[PDB]
Design an enzyme around this catalytic site. Sequence first.
Site, short mmCIF file in Angstrom:
data_model
loop_
_atom_site.label_atom_id
_atom_site.label_comp_id
_atom_site.label_asym_id
_atom_site.label_seq_id
_atom_site.Cartn_x
_atom_site.Cartn_y
_atom_site.Cartn_z
N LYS A 123 0.85 -1.20 0.00
CA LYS A 123 0.00 0.00 0.00
C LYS A 123 0.89 1.25 0.00
O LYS A 123 0.68 2.16 0.80
CB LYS A 123 -0.98 0.00 1.20
CG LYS A 123 -2.07 -1.07 1.20
CD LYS A 123 -2.66 -1.26 2.60
CE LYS A 123 -4.10 -1.76 2.59
NZ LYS A 123 -4.30 -3.14 2.07
N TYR A 165 20.17 -39.63 32.47
CA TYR A 165 19.85 -38.23 32.67
C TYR A 165 18.75 -37.90 33.66
O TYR A 165 19.00 -37.24 34.66
CB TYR A 165 19.50 -37.64 31.33
CG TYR A 165 20.63 -37.54 30.38
CD1 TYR A 165 21.65 -36.60 30.57
CD2 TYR A 165 20.66 -38.35 29.23
CE1 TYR A 165 22.69 -36.50 29.63
CE2 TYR A 165 21.67 -38.24 28.29
CZ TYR A 165 22.68 -37.32 28.50
OH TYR A 165 23.70 -37.23 27.58
N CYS A 210 26.39 -38.37 27.02
CA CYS A 210 27.22 -37.60 26.11
C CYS A 210 27.35 -36.17 26.60
O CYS A 210 28.42 -35.57 26.47
CB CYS A 210 26.72 -37.72 24.64
SG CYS A 210 26.88 -39.45 24.00
N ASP A 221 29.19 -36.17 17.70
CA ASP A 221 28.96 -36.50 16.32
C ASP A 221 28.58 -35.22 15.58
O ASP A 221 27.44 -34.79 15.62
CB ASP A 221 27.80 -37.49 16.23
CG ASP A 221 27.45 -37.85 14.79
OD1 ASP A 221 28.21 -37.48 13.86
OD2 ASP A 221 26.44 -38.52 14.59
#
Lengths: 543, 527
Positions: free
Chosen positions: B33, B349, B409, B432
């Site tokens: 616009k 964990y 990890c 990784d």
Amino acid sequence: MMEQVCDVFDIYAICACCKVESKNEGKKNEVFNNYTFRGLGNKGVLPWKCNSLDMKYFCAVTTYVNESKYEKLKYKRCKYLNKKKLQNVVVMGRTSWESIPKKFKPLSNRINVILSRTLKKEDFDEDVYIINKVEDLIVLLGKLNYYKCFIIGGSVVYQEFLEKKLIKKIYFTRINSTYECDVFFPEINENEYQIISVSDVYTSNNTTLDFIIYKKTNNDDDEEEDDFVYFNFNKEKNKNSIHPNDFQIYNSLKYKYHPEYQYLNIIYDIMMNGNKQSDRTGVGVLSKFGYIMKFDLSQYFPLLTTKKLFLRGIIEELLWFIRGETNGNTLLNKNVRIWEANGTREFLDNRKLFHREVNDLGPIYGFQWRHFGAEYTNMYDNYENKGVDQLKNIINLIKNDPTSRRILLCAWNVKDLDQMALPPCHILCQFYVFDGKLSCIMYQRSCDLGLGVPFNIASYSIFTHMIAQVCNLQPAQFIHVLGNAHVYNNHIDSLKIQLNRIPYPFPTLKLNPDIKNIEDFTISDFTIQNYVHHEKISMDMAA
Amino acid sequence: VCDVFDIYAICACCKVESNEVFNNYTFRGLGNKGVLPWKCNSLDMKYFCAVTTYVNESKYEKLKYKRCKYLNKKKLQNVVVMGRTSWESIPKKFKPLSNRINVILSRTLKKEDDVYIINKVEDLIVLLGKLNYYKCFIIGGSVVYQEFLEKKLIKKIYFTRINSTYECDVFFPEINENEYQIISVSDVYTSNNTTLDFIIYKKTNDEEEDDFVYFNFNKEKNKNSIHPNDFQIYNSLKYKYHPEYQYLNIIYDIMMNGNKQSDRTGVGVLSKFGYIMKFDLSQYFPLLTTKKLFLRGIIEELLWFIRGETNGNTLLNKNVRIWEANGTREFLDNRKLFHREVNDLGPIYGFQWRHFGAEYTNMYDNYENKGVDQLKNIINLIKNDPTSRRILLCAWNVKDLDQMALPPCHILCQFYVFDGKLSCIMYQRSCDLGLGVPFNIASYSIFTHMIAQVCNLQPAQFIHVLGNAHVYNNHIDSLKIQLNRIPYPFPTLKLNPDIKNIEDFTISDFTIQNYVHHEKISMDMAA
Ligand SMILES: NC(=O)c1ccc[n+]([C@@H]2O[C@H](COP(=O)([O-])OP(=O)(O)OC[C@H]3O[C@@H](n4cnc5c(N)ncnc54)[C@H](OP(=O)(O)O)[C@@H]3O)[C@@H](O)[C@H]2O)c1
Ligand SMILES: NC(=O)c1ccc[n+]([C@@H]2O[C@H](COP(=O)([O-])OP(=O)(O)OC[C@H]3O[C@@H](n4cnc5c(N)ncnc54)[C@H](OP(=O)(O)O)[C@@H]3O)[C@@H](O)[C@H]2O)c1
Ligand SMILES: CCc1nc(N)nc(N)c1OCCCOc1cccc(-c2c(N)nc(N)nc2CC)c1
Ligand SMILES: CCc1nc(N)nc(N)c1OCCCOc1cccc(-c2c(N)nc(N)nc2CC)c1
Ligand SMILES: O=c1ccn([C@H]2C[C@H](O)[C@@H](COP(=O)(O)O)O2)c(=O)[nH]1
Ligand SMILES: O=c1ccn([C@H]2C[C@H](O)[C@@H](COP(=O)(O)O)O2)c(=O)[nH]1
């Protein structure tokens, strides 16, 4: 205005100096300075005989040429005097010429110039220029196509080029060992020359060495450069009103490659950009979160040189850890006071350890290393085969499964934290084995940059050596990870002083090589060799 | 002509309102616009202004030289060029643009309307070869951008990617991939509730310098057998400032300098030891954009950690298969966990976070008030004692390692609080790079936001410390492809703001917004 000969003709000096066998009564509290490295020759030869790495560096500097920089030097020299392969000039005294073996003379790929009165051109078979005065060289350089001119030796030759103000820079190798000398590099006057660059520290031929540069003091795409300024539009006191000119020496250096700068840059970063915080009481830190330093243990032992450190305490601490001991009296009886404040009645009471004996530090490092998960009782208990002997396990993994990504030694026992005099600062060690070489990562949760970190670096580097040896490996890297990194307010002045000191090449650590088990080291198995250091600093200047 | 006069373009584009595929043309929305589609962006405004008002004085002596040999012949300031529609879209309070030499292309209005007007495209060329200007910026108009780009006339495009979606009616023209290529990519930023970054499209074709070479005398002349050719885009970029480069530079580092090792049955890795990445969670959500990543699984895994669960079936029943392989009969037996139920992952964990030190029994036991609830403790530490240097959540329980399906990890998180802002370091022992690390970044970034929000703090940095960092041999081809992709501006993460207890999050509380990514890559290209 007016142009110096050393500038127009790019006359530089390159030398290598060792420390000198000057006998002193009490080699504890020996003063070190720049003049420490001053030994140039013995009975016509090099004092250390041979150093492959200094040779390699010497070869690199004296044969390096940049053909595109040439025409700017050519025009410049031509202007000053009114007016295929490019080479450097090397200039030497006759005695130095004669000390070089025949197979190596003339120096390859360089224009060889020899200074002599007793010998003339007819006395040399080789492709060399024979000059009989310094003035002859200047005349020669106005007539040659050449890149740079290096004055490579003879203290007589060095002295007179410095006497005559003909040196723009000195490429100076510091051979960090002691040898019989009879010839010496002249004392560099610090008003005439300042150090502008310091290299990495290396090992070669059983010595550490580094390379420094002294400078003579004040008597088809380039469209990409602007983009840098654009991408930097959102940057910013830096944050902290510590001052620029306080770090004059620190900021004047161009290449700060000595590994000690890994520690000194962190101080600077914290001082300049640190967050202001307050411990329980009203101390008093600047802090930051998350750093990594790396030290190459195959090349040097990273004992800080910008102040004096003693290691007997931390070695005894490490041995105390390895024995599994938690008895603070053991250390106090060896006059090691590292753990003393944390063992007092008042300290233990304030930890709510009302039932713990004075100097009984609880299930801290030693206990966790040898007996993790066992039920702590008191410091005199025989914990034989209780809990996890993680120290023996990691030695076994390194020997028998070197590629394991599980070789971790961990002190942070969550169950035991509240029973410890204090929770461990050094959380864990991880190991890595490649090609017969052992690296160690240590993660530290809390790091007093001013007082603790210099010792911590030393501790874990020693421990890495120890683990390497009993595993039949060579040490490679010690990698220090810093979580909460802080400088105490009350250390700042002392660290300012320190930041303006130029580091010396690092010492070396020797272990008695007969020791084959982790449990077998005693204090006399450890030698720090060739520790060259600035004076002792009190970090807190309180009195 | 393009190199000749030192002409440039500067623009900002957003995404257009309507799986789906992304490319550079995703960012094309220019106007709506007759105004900007996002209305106002303060950072982009600051950048545009900094680009179009900057001069270095000693640089126009080289160009009175160079330019005035093509047409053949108080203060120094830049030129800004627009169209009529652009000009009359700017509020008059700001017109003409301060410290800048304005120029307008128009057919209908003329000169008697220190402002300038030009009739035709080539009327610029002639008008430029008259004036005192540092650099020249075409600053707007779809149409103005369009017919300038067709006739090949720009040295560099300075291009803002506004990483959100707005109603549009005019568009930037599709930059031809052969005429211009990206050479540079900024940091990612947040401003006005959007992320955005800044990219540069380029037109396709002192005594201390020797001291540098000397200090490099002992370096090798590059260990490994990957190829130079293959990372052409990656090696062609000048400024690699997008924080996705933290990850991409680590892959490059490992590929080029990694040690060749072979672990279990001789899989083959390249490995290095010890890196640090840092992500500014206040500016962006660091979900990798150079491949497609999915988060439902990792969020579920996180919720499962927080509940203290060690029951692998809970995740499988939600089709989260992250732990599946580690819960089989055969895996457990090979760990010597002969007496462990299938999918009973042992004291991993969740058990360590909520019950460190309790005696593990089985995945079904009630452990209420057994062991140390470290998770509650760290939260209480952040609230009661933010300056503590003991705010650590640790999963490496040395006593329990053998009882776990595998040792963690992610060894620990440590937290840091300054000025109402929360940072987190996570130490990772084994990484990784190809498959695991991209999820790991995301996981712990989410966890950081969660912990901050339940503590009434704003997230600051997530800091990832990599121990054994490795690239599997047979990801290499995939990672070479990935390194050649240019990152998009990062998405943002929104948490349901109502949740103020760590235990009360559910899957619908998490929304990733404005995720623009290159296509999925199979890390293993194996069939
Ligand atoms: N570590 C290092 O960096 C380094 C480098 C070079 C040498 N060295 C060592 O240093 C020692 C050699 O040094 P040095 O001081 O004994 O001797 P030198 O400087 O190598 O040679 C001095 C001789 O050079 C000639 N000479 C010097 N200046 C002259 C001038 N202005 N005009 C004409 N002739 C000039 C004279 O030759 P005549 O006697 O023939 O007239 C003089 O006797 C040896 O031990 C060598 O191993 C060490
Ligand atoms: N970076 C950004 O995001 C950015 C920057 C600026 C503007 N914008 C937006 O873009 C929109 C405007 O773009 P637009 O392309 O529709 O309009 P525009 O390009 O600003 O203006 C087009 C007008 O320029 C004149 N013109 C174009 N080519 C010409 C030629 N060869 N010779 C003579 N005159 C010529 C004509 O004006 P007459 O015939 O009427 O004289 C034409 O109608 C606005 O919505 C604005 O908000 C965005
Ligand atoms: C080139 C000298 C040499 N070469 C081989 N191949 N064998 C030897 N035995 C030998 O020594 C003969 C002793 C005479 O000393 C010199 C002669 C020239 C140069 C330097 C020299 C220097 N100016 N700056 C540095 N940094 N480092 C060195 C030593 C490499 C020392
Ligand atoms: C000065 C513009 C302005 N300012 C306030 N405060 N309100 C407005 N409504 C407004 O106009 C809105 C209509 C069109 O705006 C333009 C005009 C020229 C250039 C750009 C422009 C550009 N070429 N490249 C980038 N990257 N970013 C921008 C946006 C700042 C935008
Ligand atoms: O070997 C050590 C021992 C202690 N500290 C310092 C770091 C902290 O300043 C303090 C420990 O206190 P907390 O951070 O645990 O409160 O001791 C070290 O840097 N290194
Ligand atoms: O969240 C994870 C989980 C696993 N790994 C990878 C790293 C290793 O390749 C392997 C871990 O097993 P060991 O390193 O202990 O064999 O899984 C990750 O990067 N992230």
